[PDB]
Amino acid sequence: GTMTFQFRNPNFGGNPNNGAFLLNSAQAQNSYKD
Amino acid sequence: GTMTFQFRNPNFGGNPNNGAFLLNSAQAQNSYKD
Amino acid sequence: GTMTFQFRNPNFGGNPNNGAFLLNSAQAQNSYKD
Amino acid sequence: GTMTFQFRNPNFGGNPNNGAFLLNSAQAQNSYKD
Amino acid sequence: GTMTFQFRNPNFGGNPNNGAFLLNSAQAQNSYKD
Amino acid sequence: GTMTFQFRNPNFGGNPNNGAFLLNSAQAQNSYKD
Amino acid sequence: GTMTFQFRNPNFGGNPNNGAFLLNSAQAQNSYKD
Amino acid sequence: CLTAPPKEAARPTLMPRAQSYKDLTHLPAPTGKIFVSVYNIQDETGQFKPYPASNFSTAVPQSATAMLVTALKDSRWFIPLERQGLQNLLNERKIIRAAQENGTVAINNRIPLQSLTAANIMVEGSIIGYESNVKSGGVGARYFGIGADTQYQLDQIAVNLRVVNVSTGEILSSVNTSKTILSYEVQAGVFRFIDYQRLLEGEVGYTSNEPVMLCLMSAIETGVIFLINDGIDRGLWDLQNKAERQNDILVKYRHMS
Amino acid sequence: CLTAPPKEAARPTLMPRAQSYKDLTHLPAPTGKIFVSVYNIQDETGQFKPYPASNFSTAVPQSATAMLVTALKDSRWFIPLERQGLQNLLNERKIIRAAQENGTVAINNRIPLQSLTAANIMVEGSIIGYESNVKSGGVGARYFGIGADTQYQLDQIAVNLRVVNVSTGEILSSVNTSKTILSYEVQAGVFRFIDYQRLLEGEVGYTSNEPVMLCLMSAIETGVIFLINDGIDRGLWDLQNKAERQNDILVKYRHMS
Amino acid sequence: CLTAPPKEAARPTLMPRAQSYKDLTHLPAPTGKIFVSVYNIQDETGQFKPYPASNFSTAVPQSATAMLVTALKDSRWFIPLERQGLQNLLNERKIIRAAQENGTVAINNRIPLQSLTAANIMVEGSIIGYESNVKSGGVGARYFGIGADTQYQLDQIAVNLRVVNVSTGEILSSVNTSKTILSYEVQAGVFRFIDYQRLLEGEVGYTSNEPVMLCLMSAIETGVIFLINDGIDRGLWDLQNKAERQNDILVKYRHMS
Amino acid sequence: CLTAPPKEAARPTLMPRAQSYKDLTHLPAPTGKIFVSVYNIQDETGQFKPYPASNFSTAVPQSATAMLVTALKDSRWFIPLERQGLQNLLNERKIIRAAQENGTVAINNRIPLQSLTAANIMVEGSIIGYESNVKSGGVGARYFGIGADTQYQLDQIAVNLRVVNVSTGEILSSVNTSKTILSYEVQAGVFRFIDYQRLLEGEVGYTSNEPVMLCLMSAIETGVIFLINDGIDRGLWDLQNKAERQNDILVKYRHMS
Amino acid sequence: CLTAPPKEAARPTLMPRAQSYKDLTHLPAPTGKIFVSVYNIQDETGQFKPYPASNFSTAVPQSATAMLVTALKDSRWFIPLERQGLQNLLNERKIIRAAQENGTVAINNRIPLQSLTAANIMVEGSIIGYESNVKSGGVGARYFGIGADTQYQLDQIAVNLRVVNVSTGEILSSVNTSKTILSYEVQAGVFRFIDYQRLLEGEVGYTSNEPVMLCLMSAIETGVIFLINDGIDRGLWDLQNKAERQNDILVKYRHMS
Amino acid sequence: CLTAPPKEAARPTLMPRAQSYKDLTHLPAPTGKIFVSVYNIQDETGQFKPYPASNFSTAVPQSATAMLVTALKDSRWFIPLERQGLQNLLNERKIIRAAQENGTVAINNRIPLQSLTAANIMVEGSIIGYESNVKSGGVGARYFGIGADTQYQLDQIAVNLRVVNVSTGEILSSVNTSKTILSYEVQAGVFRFIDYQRLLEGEVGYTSNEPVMLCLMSAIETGVIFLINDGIDRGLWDLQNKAERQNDILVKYRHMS
Amino acid sequence: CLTAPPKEAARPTLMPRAQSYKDLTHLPAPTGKIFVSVYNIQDETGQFKPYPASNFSTAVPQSATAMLVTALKDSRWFIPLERQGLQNLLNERKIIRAAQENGTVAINNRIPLQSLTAANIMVEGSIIGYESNVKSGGVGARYFGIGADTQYQLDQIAVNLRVVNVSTGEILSSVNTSKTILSYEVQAGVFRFIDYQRLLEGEVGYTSNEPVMLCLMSAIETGVIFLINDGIDRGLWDLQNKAERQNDILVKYRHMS
């Protein structure tokens, strides 16, 4: 059917139930300190 | 279709399921102390 | 369309899924002690 | 439209998704001890 | 309209999203020990 | 019926209620350090 | 009625509200170390 | 056993009538009961019950024209012709004729049709509105553990009754009576620990949604009293004993206007 | 007991009328009441109530043509013919004839039909719109524990009334009257600890949604006053005493235009 | 008490008219008012209100043909025949005839039917569209604790009016007027701790959704002015005083085209 | 006060026309304007608006046949007969006749019906499709705190216009014009701490959904220009001055094909 | 300002035609164009769009019979009679007659009706199916932070065209042409920390749902080419120059079968 | 640009036919093609697509009677009369007559109607059922990080075809052919850390829902072959060369029974 | 490629018939096949499929009267007249007559209509019920990691067949046959760690919902056998060889009663 495109990020993208994972998928990847 | 615009922030913007991430996406970015 | 106005605060405002963030958006801003 | 009035408290008021905040909005205000 | 009465407690009362608060609204009031 | 295909990952795949498990199904499998 | 078959696992199976338990039903069974 | 259908709870008494009925039945008798003709007190309110009630469940019943008839019949003032389901009456008269137009029916059980007794006036009407939650409310306070609340709503239902003179077609009187259905709810719940680990929870509830049909019946009975007063006032259906012009009841509903 | 149906709360009084009614009833009497003919003040608003109300519950009632009749009848200016449910009236006249066209009806209760009294004008109309939340609002502040709020909405309902001259078919006057239904809500709730572990919560609420039927009734009554003024102005239904041209009421609604 | 229905808030004044009405009423008088005939300015927009409004609640009202009549009647330029609910008018004339075709009606109140006055033109039309959120927007900034926002939407409603010449059936003029309904909302909320454990929260709100019926009324009034200009321009309904050809108003709407 | 209905925002100007209108109005004048007959440019698209819009809200309006008429009337090339709501026109002519078939109408205001002017061609048509999100998109990047995005969708609407020759019934020309409704949205939000515990959040938004009615109007205007070109090309409605065959506009739409 | 309706984005060009059109227009000219008659290429697919689209939004448009006409008209092979909205054509001819059956119409603008030109064949048809997601897919990989994906669906739409010989009623040829609507989507998003606490998130998206109306138009154009080939093959509408039997195009669509 | 509608993906080829078509086309030629008459192979399945598809989207298309015609036409065995949309054919013949019953049509393009060629048999039918998920399934295993799955469903569609002898009204043969639509899905996803904090996630997907229209077309083609066999067997439409009684194809479908 | 529509999975064989068919086909031949007339075995079950299936998807198909015909035709006992879609048959006979009532049809292909062969009995019927989940169930056990389950439901479908004697109108026999559709599901999933951090998850599934159309076909075939037995028993359609009265099959279905 039609592909009603929609961002994946919660910010500037609407669907908020995705915020818990996305940010957690970056603190878990954060290889930086100081 | 019509783009019924709506804020992304929970405060002054309605959709509350976004509050858990947004604020957490700022405590994780908070590079300030004292 | 019509803008069915509704408070943002959970207390005296209905939408309760916003309570977790609002209060947390104030303990994180609380610069007071004693 | 009609304003179908409804309490804000979860107890004696129905909407239960508001219980997490209300009580937390009182432990955070509790200035008493002993 | 008709007032379809319904208990407030989750046990013997159905609406389960109220269990988190009610019990927490009693551990926070528990002034007993031993 | 028709198989409306949809990704399983929350990122680039939409369904966000799957983010809590997927990432947790990788931190639990993470056999790396340093 | 018709039995619209659907996997039980959240990954490759869709229903994501099952991810919290399944993985937890394996860390609780994990009898391995090192 | 377990498989027997439930046994009956209450005695199916007469429909409970409000004060307005015991206020309507005791009216002064007129010179002569008037043949009246009520066709259809339709449901002009255009309101359907909100969630969770089904979409099609009309707010106020389509009962009226079966409650207005009872109202008129009760006061010893009107004799209500049918004129509602009249087509069934005409079918039954067609059958009476086709059954005794041979004269062969037994001389005992032959029904002497006269002609459809026709009425001098006609009480048309409507349910001109049923607004929900015109005035909500409700207070609830809860101390340590113990708590108690209250809610109440008013549903206002208005009814219009027009006595149209069938001779000249014009309207003689038209009254608008309102009623405020009251729907309230009370609860009291105790959820405090009483001992170290003995949680005593309890809860008592109660709720009363005044039935819309009974409020509509009281509204229509008051409407009938107002019709009888607006008639007695000017020109129509004068009383049997003019001394009862200042009756206890006909002065109560005379001053409400 | 517990199984008795609820007892009745309030007395089904007359429908509460706004100021515009006590402003309409006291109009100067004309030379002679005019036969008027109101057929159908239809529901042209095309609006249905939002959630949670059922999908089909019309926003404003289909009441009108039963409230406009009362409006016209109230002011001592118009005599409203039925012309609504006219088919029932014609059935009842058909029955009167078929009941006394044999002359055998008892000389007492025979109804002398004259002919359908016909009206010189015709007050057509419409509910030209019911917009919801034209202007919302509401302030709420909550200090430590104690809190209080407020909300209010306006639902604007507009009504159009056209006095069409039945002789020549043209329209003589056409008025548009608006009304602003006010629906507000107040709450005040206390949720602060008062002691170490004694949580005092309490909450009082209240809400008033002005009923749409009463606002529509007031709008139609004002519309009727404007019709009477637009007539008295130019050519129609001149007053009994021309000195009352500057009446207290006919100068209020004369200057609103 | 608590059980009385709510008391009335505002005075049901005349419908608030935009500038275009006080711009339309003051038009130069023509030689003679033209009989006009408006049948049905239907709802060609095919749009229904979004959630939460009911599925069937039409976006723009079916009001038109009851607002265009008022528009035409207001400017001293057209005399609007009914032609809408004409069937009711013909029923009332049927009744007038059947009531005085015996000559027995009282010589005072007999209605001299002439014939249905017929109009030289016919103003057909449509609501050619109601698009929602043609242009949304809204800024909101919130510093420490204090915050304030704003939203606004435009709903564009377009109306088409065609003056068709009834003699030869062809169209003389056709105008398209748009209007931009503005629906905005403002809030300001304070949620900062002021003391160690004294949380001061507060919030003020406001919202204005310009009513669709009033915007449609202004659109139709401008459409009527454009019709009068497109006529005055070429061949039709020339003014009484040709010097007023360059009137202050007839030059404003002449240059908008 | 608070209870006054909202005041009007913008001036209800003429409907904003695209370039294609100022491109259509300036066409070379033909020998003589052609009587044209447009019956129903129906809504063959069979598309309804998605969520949250109501289920029944048609995607493109049923406006057409009221916008094509304006298109034809605007270019000084066609004189559009009504033929839409023709039944109302025939009722008004029936009334004109029944009003002056006695000759007793005042010699001034008698309407000389000639006969329904009939048109040489007929511009049938359709909205052959409205596809939603034919091509979506949108980029959004957000650095530390500050972020900004964009979205855009295209809704393609196609319109078919067929000039059928009414004499012989065959089709002379048939054009398909498309239009791409553009609906875009921009936001920019700042959610970074600026101090130790001073959270500065802010957000500005904007959105423009080009109205479907205006895109349809531009599509139909281009369709009309293509009809005029496909006619001028072969055999029909030759221009007044053949030198204008290579007009600036008639060469632009001649090469688009 | 903010209250002006949105300005127009793109130029409403002709409907973009696929290769099959520039493949259809360049067909060898026949001996003589054939009068063809297309009544209703109905929507036999019985498919409606899934969520979130409204329940009633038909999957493929009801456009056809307005796109098949254009297809036939484009190739210089058929002259399409109307036969669709024929009732409007017959009303306009009724009006032409009733307008010039007095001979009083001006000798210039009188329309010489001949008779409804009747066609030798009739191209009936159907949209025999629109299946959604006949073949989905889509790969997406995401390394540390950076990620990119893709999705694509095929919606297969099949169209049947039957050239029925109107003389003897039998079918001469029947072709089934399919088309695969392609709807794909691409995204690329970056959500990696770049510094200690500087989160750089960004995301670009794009999506193309090929419009169903254009795919249907290409399917129908190919169907028309196949009809012309199946005719040229056996007995019907032989070409003007038999040497063009092996034309570049008539050999491409001859071998697809 | 960004505002151009999407470009076309695939070439709209002929509808892909299964083996049963290349198995049906190569049948032995009979003595003479039989005129056949197929009226309506209706949708007797009474099944609509589940969620998320719209409520009204019929499971199997209403295509049939436009696919059975193609089936019959393809095998060189039947000549299918229209008899579907026959009313359009009769309108076109009415127009042919009314166009040449004056003899004034040009001697070249006059259509010699013979009479509606009538067929010796009639192939009625139905889609006697479309059951969804008659047999689901699907295995999926996922080791550390890497995982892969599979799903598949069968939707069984059955079709009934009855060759009724139109002379005597009785049924000659009746066949039931089933088809198993296969809808499967494959995925493979990798979600394992590859380094300390470098998460490599990736996922490839694919899905094929065999289109219901193509399965129905294959079912109907097999049904036609079975009809031809059940005829060739006993008494009807004997082959041209009896030696081909044991043809390679007529022995395959002879033994399936 | 990726854009080709899916290729076909299985061969569209004959509809799989249960044991009852191979039990029905091998019945003893009667003296002579009886002309039978089956009009409409309607869907009296009044059941629609639950969620997620669409609201309108009937539980059992409307197939019957196209499966009962096949049942009767299969057993060499009845010759089924059409009588279903009879109106199409009568249209085709009307066309045969209107095509050869001039005698000008070619002497070869002229269809000698005899008259509608009329049947001696009539097999009316119904689907008297389809109850869902008459008996659910399902066991599932899961040890450490490994787990396996099972579910099964029965949907009982009952069918009634009445052989009504068309001569005298009375019913000769009436049989009720039930069938238990079985819908079961099996899964087995492994979700145990096998190493320190190597999670092996896997899962195999399977499901079989016996198609309702096949169960209905078997129910109707058994119903036909019971009809043939109830006839052979008393008076009707006696066998060819009375020795086969105790046939292996006619004793199986004789003792089931």
Numbering used by the authors:
A (entry chain f), B (entry chain h), C (entry chain e), D (entry chain b), E (entry chain a), F (entry chain d), ...: 21 to 54
H (entry chain A), I (entry chain B), J (entry chain E), K (entry chain H), L (entry chain F), M (entry chain D), ...: 16 to 272
The study reports:
To obtain the structure of the CsgG-CsgF complex, the full-length E. coli csgG and csgF genes were co-expressed in E. coli strain BL21 (DE3), and the purified CsgG-CsgF complex was applied to the glow-discharged GIG R1/1(Cu) grid for cryo-EM specimen preparation. We collected cryo-EM images for the sample, and cryo-EM structure determination using multiple rounds of three-dimensional (3D) classification and refinement resulted in a density map with an overall resolution of 3.6 Å (S1A, S1B). Overall, the structure of the CsgG-CsgF complex reveals that CsgF forms a 1:1 stable complex with CsgG via its N-terminus (residues 20–53 of the full-length CsgF), yet its C-terminus including residues 54–138 is invisible in the map due to flexibility. The nonameric CsgG structure in the CsgG-CsgF complex is almost identical to the crystal structure of the nonameric CsgG with a root-mean-square deviation (RMSD) of approximately 0.5 Å for all 1,854 aligned Cα atoms. By contrast, the visible CsgG-bound CsgF fragment adopts a loop-helix-loop conformation, distinct from its nuclear magnetic resonance (NMR) structure but consistent with the result of secondary structural prediction. Strikingly, the nonameric CsgG-CsgF complex forms a secretion pore with 2 constriction regions. In addition to the constriction region that is lined with 3 stacked 9-residue rings consisting of either Tyr66, Asn70, or Phe71 of CsgG, the CsgG-bound CsgF adds another constriction region to the CsgG channel. This pore eyelet is formed by 9 Asn36 residues, contributed by each CsgF molecule, with a diameter of approximately 14.8 Å. From the structure of the CsgG-CsgF complex and the isolated CsgF NMR structure, we learned that the orientation between the N-terminus and the C-terminal domain of CsgF is not conformationally fixed, which made the C-terminus of CsgF invisible in the cryo-EM structure.
Curli are functional amyloids that play critical roles in biofilm formation and adhesion in many Enterobacteriaceae. Two outer membrane proteins, CsgG and CsgF, form the core apparatus for secretion and assembly of the curli structural subunits. In this work, we show that CsgF forms a stable complex with CsgG via a 1:1 stoichiometry by lining the extracellularly faced lumen of the nonameric CsgG channel via its N-terminal 27 residues, creating a secretion channel with 2 constriction regions for curli subunit secretion. The free C-terminal domain of CsgF recruits and binds the secreted nucleator CsgB, creating a growth point for further addition of CsgA subunits.
